[PDB]
């Protein structure tokens, strides 16, 4: 997270930290719990073994609130397009249901086809890098303003307002960044977006998956 | 093991995961070229044709001592030279 502040420990109990195995190294992503047995994240976070940490604040410390669960099954959206990063959404079925408590609890999803007006202030949280030189051991968060679709249509030729959200005022040093992919965009305590992509510079606007465009798939996949 | 963060930008888009390579030994630049092209393919669907026709297709190594090396993915005249990956701090990959 660029330009944010440390979260109050365990104030965002739906947040998940993902460790992903790849053929020549590893990746790190965020995610968020949507049911006791399912985490939502970005499809570009897929890999060949995924571990989910829930209940964390400092991910580099051994906290007794942490729950470490392997993903049983990783279900990318069938129309995910790696080239344009379209339909960038994935469900992780957890190998075991969480112990629900004050530190681990699911976040609410939007209603089917629910919109999100330009100008709305939202929050994003994650464990990603905070600049080009430093990261964070602890969960951080920043408030971002939803942009008019016009802004991302001009910057990103593959942007689609029907399935994505344009987020972040270019004039502020505030953004989601590397390692925050898959984390939620929260607007009035509902997860409307998934961190997807932006510029290597970290300069907004950035593109989020629009969760409400995928609710039928989410519901079918969890059933 | 030696961990090397890298970033992929294709057509002006960077996915916002955090990715690292893990190295154990010395390697030729051509082996790093292969790792880079393999990730371009598996993360962003980049083909050999896309690379070869692109306005720019490069990766830049930043070494721990601050030196930077720009490698052309279309034709790397240094493919057969070696590097100790433990000297590599991070890799920036850019196509288009």
UniProtKB/Swiss-Prot annotation, chain A:
Pfam families xref list: Trypsin (PF00089)
Region called Important for antimicrobial activity, residue ranges: 1-5, 77-91
Annotated effect of mutating residue 51 to A: No effect on proteolytic processing, enzyme activation or sorting to cytoplasmic granules
Keyword terms, alphabetized: Antibiotic, Antimicrobial, Cell membrane, Chemotaxis, Cytoplasm, Disulfide bond, Glycoprotein, Hydrolase, Lysosome, Membrane, Nucleus, Protease, Secreted, Serine protease, Signal, Zymogen
Disulfide bonds: 29-45, 122-187, 152-166
Single GO MF descriptor: peptidase activity
Reactions catalysed, as given in the entry: Specificity similar to chymotrypsin C
Subcellular location: Cell membrane; Cytoplasmic granule; Secreted; Cytoplasm, Cytosol
Glycosylation sites: 51
Gene Ontology CC: azurophil granule lumen; collagen-containing extracellular matrix; cytoplasmic stress granule; cytosol; extracellular exosome; extracellular region; extracellular space; lysosome
Transmembrane region(s): none
PROSITE patterns (alphabetical): TRYPSIN_DOM, TRYPSIN_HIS, TRYPSIN_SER
Enzyme class: hydrolase
Activity regulation note: Inhibited by soybean trypsin inhibitor, benzamidine, the synthetic peptide R13K, Z-Gly-Leu-Phe-CH2Cl, phenylmethylsulfonyl fluoride, 3,4-dichloroisocoumarin, DFP, SBTI and alpha-1-antitrypsin. Inhibited by LPS from P.aeruginosa but not by LPS from S.minnesota. Not inhibited by elastinal, CMK, TLCK, ETDA or leupeptin. (Microbial infection) Inhibited reversibly by S.aureus EapH1.
InterPro entries tied to this protein: Peptidase_S1_PA, Peptidase_S1_PA_chymotrypsin, Peptidase_S1A, Trypsin_dom, TRYPSIN_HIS, TRYPSIN_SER
Known role: Serine protease with trypsin- and chymotrypsin-like specificity. Also displays antibacterial activity against Gram-negative and Gram-positive bacteria independent of its protease activity. Prefers Phe and Tyr residues in the P1 position of substrates but also cleaves efficiently after Trp and Leu. Shows a preference for negatively charged amino acids in the P2' position and for aliphatic amino acids both upstream and downstream of the cleavage site. Required for recruitment and activation of platelets which is mediated by the F2RL3/PAR4 platelet receptor.
Family per similarity comment: Belongs to the peptidase S1 family.
Subunit relationships: (Microbial infection) Interacts with CASP4; the interaction is promoted by the Td92 surface protein of the periodontal pathogen T.denticola and leads to CASP4 activation.
Annotated protein name in UniProt: Cathepsin G
Taxonomic source organism: Homo sapiens
Origin organism lineage: Eukaryota, Metazoa, Chordata, Craniata, Vertebrata
